[PDB]
Structures are given as C-alpha cells and as structure tokens.
Design a binder for these strands. Structure first.
Lengths: 93, 46, 241
RNA sequence: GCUCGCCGGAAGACCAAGGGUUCCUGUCCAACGUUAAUCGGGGCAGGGUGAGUCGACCCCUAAGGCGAGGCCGAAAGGCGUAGUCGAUGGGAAACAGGUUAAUAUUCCUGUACUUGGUGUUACUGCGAAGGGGGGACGGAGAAGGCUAUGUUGGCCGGGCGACGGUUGUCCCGGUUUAAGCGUGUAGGCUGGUUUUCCAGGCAAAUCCGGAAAAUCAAGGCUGAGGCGUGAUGACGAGGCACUACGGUGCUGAAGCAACAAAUGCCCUGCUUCCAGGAAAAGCCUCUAAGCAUCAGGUAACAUCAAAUCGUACCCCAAACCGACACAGGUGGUCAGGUAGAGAAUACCAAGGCGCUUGAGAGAACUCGGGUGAAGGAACUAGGCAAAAUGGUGCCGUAACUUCGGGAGAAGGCACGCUGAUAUGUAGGUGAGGUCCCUCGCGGAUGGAGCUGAAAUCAGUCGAAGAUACCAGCUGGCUGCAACUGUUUAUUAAAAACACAGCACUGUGCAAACACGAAAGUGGACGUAUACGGUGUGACGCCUGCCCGGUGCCGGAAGGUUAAUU
RNA sequence: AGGACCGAACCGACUAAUGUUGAAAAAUUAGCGGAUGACUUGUGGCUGGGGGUGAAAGGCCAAUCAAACCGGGAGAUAGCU
C-alpha cells in the first residue's frame, strides 16, 4: 500500500566507506543515500520490493552539507539522508 | 562586562521575523521597499 | 488581640501584630480559587496610571457572595478564614442543602452559628433581609446601593452605617464618612456589624511589610474639590463634615 | 618515554541558549598563528551524527499576542467575545558491559516497560464542550532512617627491596554489579462498613455534598530503603598462545564484614508563621440526545505501529558576546583524600595544562614584594598607603539604654608530642545466644570490632606549640541621619533618595485620578479602618500668635460682562 | 522568626596603586558592604521618544540623551571661518 514509482525514486544509491564496510561485515548492514523526505515506511517498502530481502529495522539520519568556498564564493553542499538497513537474513552484497 | 548583543534566535525571529513584520502594515511597506531595492535577505534566514 | 514584639532589632523593633487564634489554619477551600491575582497596576495600554503601585506577594482570589439570594435556607458557620484581598475576614457557611459559600464574618459571628436570609429571618446579627423590614435606628454593615449587587457600602473592617429614618419609599442612611444618603428600601441589608476592627493597631513594623503587600515607595515631587457628577445630587442629601 | 611545576566547588567532566561542520583521516606552508611553523580552530580530498524508551514534536494551559461577530474612530487604526497561538511549569516508557580514527541510554547479548489499532474468548449499560476526587503549588526549622561516596578488617594474586631493618600488626591493585519483578518495612495520612431520604453541583445523575439511623473501632491510602530473582550472567587484576608492534583469541579467584556520611531520598511530610502562597490537561465515577440482540466497555490471547526533527565539535572558552587565538561576561548538574566549623584557604586521586616569541646582560630608572640598628606619623592638606592583632574554651567586662543592646567591650589564663586515669573514658554504632513468637522486613536480653573528643596528673623537644594559608587593631570626644538599603553605568555612593510612623486634603461606586479624539483599562473583581495628592520622617517635651496679599472653601444688598433676541 | 551578626558562591565598585596611544572604548592587585530577603538570576511577554521608565541622578531607552536611530522637508538658514 506504498504505491509504485515512489519506491523506486525514494532511494538514490548505496554509500561506500570504511564504516560501511565494517557494518556490512559485522551486522550485515547496508548504508544508503536516499531522497530528502525518505520516510522509514517508504524505505522499508522499497527495500522489500526491490532487493527481495527482509529488513529487521530501518535507521535514518540527515547529513548536513559542507562548505567548499573557492575564494569570496561561499558555495554550500546539498542535503541528503543516510539510512542504515539491517537484513539479518540476506547474505548478499 | 556583559555586552549589549546577546544572541537569541527566538528573540530575533519574534522581534524581526517575517510573520511579525508582515503582521503590521508598516512592516509590509518595509518589505515592499526592501524588495524594490533588491536585498538578497529580506529579514533573516533561519 | 495585639502583641507587642520585643525590640530585638530595628525593623520589627516597634511592630504591632494583630493575631487572632480562632482563625482557621490551613489551606482554603480549593474549589473556590481562580484568576485575578496581582495585576501589577498596569492598564491595557501598559503605562503607569496608579503611581506608586506594583509588586507584592502572590495572593489567590476567593469568590465571596454578597447577593445572598439563598432565602429560607439556614446555614451553619464552620470556620473563619483570612482573605488577603480584603481586610475583613470571611466565614465558611455550609447551607442545609449542601452549598459551601463565603460571606463576610461580623463581629458577633463565631464558629457554630446559624444564619438564615429572607424576609422572615429573626432580627439578630448575621442575618440578611430587605431594608424594608429593618427597624429604624439599628446599625448595619454590607449595605447595598441598588438591589441585585450585594453590599456596596461598608465592607472594610470596622465599618458601620446607622439608619436614621425612612421618609417614604426611600431610606436615609448616615455613612461612616459622615454624610446622609437616600437609598432604595428594597435593597438587601445584613444585620450586625463587620468583624475584627483592629486594623489601625498594626503599624507594619518595617518597610518590607508594605513593600511585599504591593505598595511601592512614594517619591516627593489642597482643598480643591473635584466632585462633579450632577446625577446623584437628588440621591445624596449633604456631604461629609 | 622520563623528570619539575599549576588547577584539581577548576585551569576537570556532562547538558540548553549560543556558532553551524571548526570533529577524524590523507596531503601543502604563500597569507591566516603578534616569532621559524613538518603543527593547528589555515587551504584541498574523503568519512563521521543510527531513537516508541534522550529531548524536541504533540493534547490542553500562566504572563502575554492575534482575533470571526460587535463597539469606537475622518481611513490607516484602538480595545475586545467565542475561538486560536503562546514555557520559563505540568502528561507514556531503559540499564549493565563492548565496539569505531570520529557517533551511543541510538549498534551488539539480556532483562524489560508505556501507548494505539486489528481479530478471538467470556461478561455486560455504553455514551459529554458537564458535575465530583486529586492533579494543585508559600517563607523558615528540625530531628529519625536510608543511598551514592569515603575509611578500616578479612580475602584474592604478586613482592623480600639500587642504602641501615623489612616472612610481617609489611607494601602493591581489587574487593564493582543497573531497569524490572514479589515482599511493603522505617515514616506519614485517614476513622471505616451497611441502609433510607434531599430546595444543591445550570436539566438529571448509583458520583460529590447534605440529613437520618445499625455496626466495628481495625480497615484503607501513601511510603525511601534492604531482601531473593535480575545475575551458574557482565566486569576483574594477573596470566596462556598468535603480532603488520596498532593488536587478536582463551583463562581468570576473592569479589565479603564493621564505621562515617551527605546539599541526595523518605518529605508535594511534620511544627510555626503572616506576606495566606496559579490555570488546564492526563486518570477514575455518573448522568443530556442516542443506542438499549446493535454499537461500545471490561480481563486475557496473537499480531501491527509509535511518523518527523538535533544527536560531531567549545560550552566558566582560541569555537558565544566584546572589531582579535582579548588579564572581561555567560544558566543548570557531578562535588573524592589529608587537618579543619565549611562548597574559603594549604598539598594530593582521575582529568586538563606550563598559557605562541627565546637566549644572554645582571646598570640608572619603573612596577610587585623580603629584612633592616635609633626614633615611630616627627613627611604629607589628610594614619592616604603601609604596619600590627587575628582562633578555640575559661575568668572578667564600664557610661547609657527603648532593657533588645552597648560586648567578641577593655584586660588575662592553656594550646606541640608521648604515658597513666582509660593496652581507647562517657556517648554512638551496634553480630550470636536464652524465652516466647502472628513464627519473621518480630520483640526484654548481650557483647564482638570501630570514632573516640572533653577533663586531671606526669615526661620530653624548641626562642616561638592558632607556630603553614586563612584569620577584627584597640577606646574616648563630637556634628550629621531612626536603622537596613537605592541613584549620579563613565569626576561627587553622602550630610542626596526613599524608608516603617504621623498631619492635611479629595473621593458614595458608572467614585476621585490617570492612560486615551473613543470604545476600553488600572484604581478594584476593592467599598471611608479603602484609595489618590501634598509635607515631615522612629521614640520623649510642644507645633504657639497673625487672614495684609497670593491659591482654597461657603456667596451675597449690590457695580461690571459675552454668546442670544 | 530575626529586612541579625562573623563568614563562601553571587551581587555596584567605595578606598591607594597599575593601566591614561591598556589585556579591557571601565579590568586587575590588597582591604571594604549585603550574603533568608527593600535579595539575586535563567526563560517568555508589556511600558516606543515632547514619549517610556525612573526608592529622583533631569539617570537609562543599544559604547550617545537638558529630548535615541533611519529616509524625507533639505544643497534648511547663516550679517561667521
């Protein structure tokens, strides 16, 4: 009951980092960058109906953009949400 | 000694916020003239 | 009863305390506490209009009934309470039907007394009945100026009004200020006189007594009458002397 | 890596406002750092903030804001009803241990807990924008118990000392363990149960309140803490095997007794007191219309969900406010050891630092300090600055006085350590056992070990025994002011201000006055023992005579006078 | 209980010195007062300039005040430099 296209568009792409790798090898957790709203229910539905795997708990956080001023030109980064997804049953990448 | 400027977002946005300014007609004229001038930030950016 | 505290130190070196043991000790009737606390003496605009006022200790307001519309229902007085709003004390009267209301306690009213209003109440202190049934020459308190309000005259401590004559539908009084006024006889009146009249004995001891009561200091900066009403001249007979 | 020093009721740690990525890793020294700058709060790239149990959010609320109708005003606009916003308060729930370079009560093992929906079981009177309970409240004081915490004893594992002794009443580190569950103690509060009736709680009500009777006086409510589970669990020094020298896996015993004790809890309590010390929602009971096989409510069962927002970093400073990486200011919580009256002062535990220019020289002079023979305010407008006492218990303590005070008046007595009284005294803390015992969170008992002052005698050390820091100089005369306090931020802190009391004057309630073209509000949800204005300023002796003129009160034979006709 | 005393945090700096182109456009050194109430403070709201407020100095209203800041009258006027 989460509709279509919305589930496909909610998530942007997975995130790769040392912490992400440690989480993957410790608790089989997946770190994703998702849309702005990116509600927990929408993320759950998208993961269930896209990766065909079960999700135990969904945790999300907002990462504030940085500043990369080039000299008298203050340009701030955009805003994106980081979500941690725990499967507990899927031994996939 | 305690200085004059004591930062407070609540006080600033309640004494010079967009809604507070627009509540009275005088603030509406202030906003209109600021828009005519072309100020990037009308009142405050929370 | 006044107790002269020993002059241990200035500021309560010369204080006079007005204590009265029979007054109830403890919390008041909670269901009768509401708003109208310390206002600060500031109008809606926010400017000073009654200068030398402000502050004061927090005080709750107790609803007190003056109409005495309950007629023919005897009530028993249970205790006496001190009302910070008014100098005079109040009496907690429980009606036979179960009503618990407050009323100014006269001097002759003690705990465990029967009070009944109406046109058939006996002529004894504490009762209330229309002035049309009040014998001439009997002192009164809580006098009413127009029926339906209840006791607009003589509400402060030790205030009494002596009836001199009726002279037709109206009735002529003599207020404590020393002036005779004509009032509608249908107005309700309360027999007896108000309670404790020892208000002047206390001297407040020190500055704090007046300061925390809500009175600010008066800062230094005659016979010009300013009475101009021209509507109650007929009602009033002669001014004070 | 080591030595020396400072803070350690902070110069430490945790939070909200504050700033918004300064936090970690890799890399560079042009400027940014008052100096070189491989370093950093500087530049570039990458990573980091995980919530039903934190808080916000959110239901209703105080001060206060907006304001449909409506009032007023030439209009902008002013007040204001229903209503709606508005915390600085109130409402549902979590901890032990571990983890990353950086995040945790958020992730991992466990015990758990609050709320809402879904369907089932059996029962049944359910249903408010209403009533009632409590929510729900002030200053001060205290005793009695308990907890964190600290100390001592045993125990666990390791030691025989770079130099005189150190197998022992010697040293080293530990002797830690949550939320929940049942017990409901110490303590506090309340008098209960049954039946009939009722001008009240806007109409009604089994509910509250009121009136009658029968019965008991033992029933109920609240209530820290300890107890067993929690936990045959976690942690644990120190050890046994693998190392990219950063680290990895396993093992692991004591983990108990006594004392002290808090600002923390019992306590939103107890006593006193005048200055009499908020509202609403959350929860429970009944009724209005309605429904009365329905729908709903009751306890259990299985399941679902608790959306969204910050979780880095400093938070008495290099990160906030002061133009600065500034001798300044910034709310709340944690509060160890030594001696001590303590949260001041002196040194230490964990923790953080030696403060962004250094080395020599050892002159005059400037700043802050140490001692100085003789005099001791003699200098100076001026005891200004400086110098001296400084505590404990005892003796003693004047004039006056409102009998409270003066007063710590002035002036003297002893202050270390050791032994005896008494191998450690009174007090307190306080285990077993006898007797019974609802028989255990029972009582008369009787001493284990610990604090041990205070008091007398004796011995001894030095010039000084409060020997450190900390810590009143002392009395008299005299003008001013009742005392305490308040302002001239930034030349005058008072002899100025007010101050408790007193005197005069005006105010009859739609009160006087003030804010306002005006609705309206303060006065006051008060009523001449109250309020407004003026003058003086506790207390004792008095406020005496005078109405020319100036303001005020009561008004009159009379002279003068506009609008108006 | 004490608008009590001695005395911490806290509260305005009174006194001599430093600083007077400072560390600071008002602080520090060492004494001094209150420190249970006429006390102080955090968080929100109100009193808006011929007005506010003021235990009264004609103080404060943003490092300023015997009348704050901004735009306009306004290139005010000036027998003055």
């Amino acid at each position: 009951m989460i509709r279509e296209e919305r589930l496909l568009k909610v998530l942007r792409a997975p995130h790769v980092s040392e912490k992400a790798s440690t989480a993957m090898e410790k608790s089989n957790t997946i770190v994703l960058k998702v849309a702005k709203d990116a509600t927990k229910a929408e993320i759950k539905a998208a993961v269930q109906k896209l990766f065909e795997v079960e999700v135990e708990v969904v945790n999300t956080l907002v990462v504030k953009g940085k500043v990369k001023r080039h000299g008298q030109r203050i340009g701030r980064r955009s805003d994106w949400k980081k979500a941690y997804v725990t499967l507990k049953e899927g031994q996939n990448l | 000694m305690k200085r004059t400027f004591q930062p407070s977002v609540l006080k600033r946005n309640r004494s010079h916020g967009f809604r507070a300014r627009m509540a009275t007609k005088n603030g509406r004229q202030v906003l209109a003239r600021r828009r005519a001038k072309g100020r990037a930030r009308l009142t405050v950016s929370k | 009863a006044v107790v002269k505290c020993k002059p241990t130190s200035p500021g309560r070196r010369h204080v006079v305390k007005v204590v009265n043991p029979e007054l109830h000790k403890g919390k008041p009737f909670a269901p009768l506490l509401e708003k109208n606390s310390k206002s600060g003496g500031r109008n809606n605009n926010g400017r000073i209009t009654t200068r030398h006022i402000g502050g004061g200790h927090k005080q709750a307001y107790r609803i007190v009934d003056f109409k005495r519309n309950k007629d023919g229902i005897p009530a028993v007085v249970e205790r006496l309470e001190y009302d910070p709003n008014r100098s005079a004390n109040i009496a907690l009267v429980l009606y036979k039907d179960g009503e618990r209301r407050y009323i100014l306690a006269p001097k002759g009213l003690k705990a465990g007394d029967q009070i009944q209003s109406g046109v058939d109440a006996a002529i004894k202190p504490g009762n209330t009945l229309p002035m049309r049934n009040i014998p001439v020459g009997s002192t009164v308190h809580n006098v009413e100026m127009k029926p339906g309000k209840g006791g607009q005259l003589a509400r402060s401590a030790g205030t009494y009004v002596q009836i001199v004559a009726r002279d037709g539908a109206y009735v002529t009084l003599r207020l404590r200020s020393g002036e005779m006024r004509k009032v509608e006889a249908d107005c309700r009146a309360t027999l007896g006189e108000v309670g404790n009249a020892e208000h002047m004995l206390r001297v407040l001891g020190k500055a704090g007594a007046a300061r925390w009561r809500g009175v600010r200091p008066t800062v230094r900066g005659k016979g010009k009458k300013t009475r101009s009403n021209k509507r109650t001249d007929k009602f009033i007979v002669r001014r004070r002397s």
